[PDB]
Amino acid sequence: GSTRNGRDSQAKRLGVKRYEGQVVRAGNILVRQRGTRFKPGKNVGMGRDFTLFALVDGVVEFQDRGRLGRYVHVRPL
Amino acid sequence: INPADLRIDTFRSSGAGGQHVNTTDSAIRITHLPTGIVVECQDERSQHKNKAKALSVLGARIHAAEMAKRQQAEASTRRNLLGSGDRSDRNRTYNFPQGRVTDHRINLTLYRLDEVMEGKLDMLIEPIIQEHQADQLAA
């Protein structure tokens, strides 16, 4: 008797890294995700792995637009 | 293999193994009470690995001893019907000279070899079937 299992991959520690109302600097990663669980909003870029980051200094704001998806914004200071 | 007819005997094995052979029993020794076959093993160390082979060989003799008594019954029966007297003996003789199909059981002789040794004959067995009722019926 033996196992044909026993494998698993390293945890990737995905998710939001900066919540609404938090003071960020340009470049701060805001969301780590697989695909677009959140979409880039105003002053928010998205990297080749769907990572959202701040484009400007400011304050993070989230917005749920229904069928248009959830968006992450940065409001300049 | 149903359990109501099995008395299982456990105890200590016999031979090499050290203090484990001395202490742990582990020698299964079954006894099939109706048939009498006793197959008894000590090969693997656990009595449950020993239980397996003990059960798996009782069947090989419960089946062997029944298949014998049934094929011993298949040769005692067949030897009588065919009869070693296959030179000339029991049932019928078929004349191809004069066509006398005869059955020596009763007597009835006829010329229906053309109609019998070239087709069916369900009606010429009837006297052999009818004379065999009055054989049993009248006595």
Partner: protein, 141 residues
């Protein structure tokens, strides 16, 4: 006997037996029901023994409804192995049953017949049971 025709996964974690039933707590088909009074994994062996107990009492006639289904695989390691080396093999299937579930239902049968058949079937199960008859409370569900 009862077991899934197919499944996505062969083996299933054991889980828990907290609380009263999620559903199935009211009579829904027959005239009388057998309700579970305490939680258990009910084996397909136990289910079928209860069923056979009822049809063999009715002798001919009536209708039995089995409202629990054993879809949960039961696992057991071979005799005399040690801990480890993976999960044991599937030896059977059980239906998770919690207090308040209607397990069996009968119809087309006199009251005394229904009372007696469900009683004998209760003796085939590993839990305390209660016999109930259809109510307005049941119809209102």
């Amino acid at each position: 006997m009862l077991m899934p025709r197919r499944m996505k996964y062969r083996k299933q974690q054991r889980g828990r037996l907290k609380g009263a039933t999620k559903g199935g707590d009211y009579v829904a088909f027959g005239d009388y029901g057998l309700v579970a009074l305490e939680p258990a994994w009910i084996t397909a062996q136990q289910i079928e023994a209860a069923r056979v107990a009822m049809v063999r009492h009715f002798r001919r006639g009536g209708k039995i409804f089995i409202r629990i289904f054993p879809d949960k695989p039961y696992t057991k390691k071979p005799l005399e192995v040690r801990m480890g080396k993976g999960k044991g093999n599937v030896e059977g299937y059980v239906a998770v049953v919690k207090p308040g579930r209607v397990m069996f239902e009968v119809a087309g049968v006199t009251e005394e017949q229904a009372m007696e058949a469900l009683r004998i079937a209760g003796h085939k199960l590993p839990i305390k049971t209660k016999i109930v008859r259809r109510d307005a409370y049941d119809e209102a569900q």
